[PDB]
């Protein structure tokens, strides 16, 4: 599909008021990691496709697809046969699906924390800047 949301971008991307140099990189960071975090778990809305032999009735294909996607997967360069047991087959093991899409959500969250820290702490000081900034400003 095709969809684009501007107001969600403009909202945090601008509306919180400060120009503070290169601290806005915390902002633009949170944007990038947030978006890519989402668009990846979007499943390009065909996560992974698999080969199954020919007698499966296609309601198994729509199974073995998932089952492959959850239970682990792995790799071998090709032509080694598989050997046997678990050793030489599963040595080279790649599943990060359990990680990427969510660990990015966590990422963006941890880039947006430090601001919240700041506003909280500077509020502890009892003397607010923001009021002053707007006041002297306008």
């Amino acid at each position: 599909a095709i969809n684009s949301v501007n107001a969600l971008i403009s909202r945090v991307f601008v509306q919180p008021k400060g120009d503070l140099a290169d601290r806005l990189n915390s902002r633009v960071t949170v944007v990038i990691l947030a978006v890519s975090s989402a668009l990846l778990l979007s499943s390009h809305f065909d996560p992974i496709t698999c080969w199954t032999p020919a007698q499966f009735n296609a309601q198994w294909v729509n199974f073995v697809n998932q089952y492959c996607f959850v239970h682990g997967t792995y790799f071998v360069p090709l032509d080694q046969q598989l050997a046997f047991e678990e050793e030489e087959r599963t040595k080279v093991s790649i599943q990060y699906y359990q990680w990427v899409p969510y660990v990015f959500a966590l990422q963006a969250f941890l880039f947006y924390i430090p601001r919240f820290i700041w506003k909280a702490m500077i509020a502890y000081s009892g003397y607010d800047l923001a009021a002053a900034v707007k006041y002297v400003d306008r």
Binding site: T29, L40, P47, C50, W51, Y97
Partner: protein, 48 residues
């Protein structure tokens, strides 16, 4: 391109097999990881 592993259960127990899957995502993830890596470690050095 990977070789997926798979199970059933019948009176014979583990009953397992392999089916090789194409993998689309891995073209994304290792398209971006480069970029995202530069851009982070940048954000570090400029933020220190």
């Amino acid at each position: 391109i990977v070789h997926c592993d798979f199970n059933r259960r019948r009176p014979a127990s583990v009953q397992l097999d392999t089916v090789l899957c194409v993998l689309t995502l891995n073209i994304y993830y290792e398209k971006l990881f480069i970029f995202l890596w530069f851009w982070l470690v940048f954000v570090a050095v400029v933020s220190t």
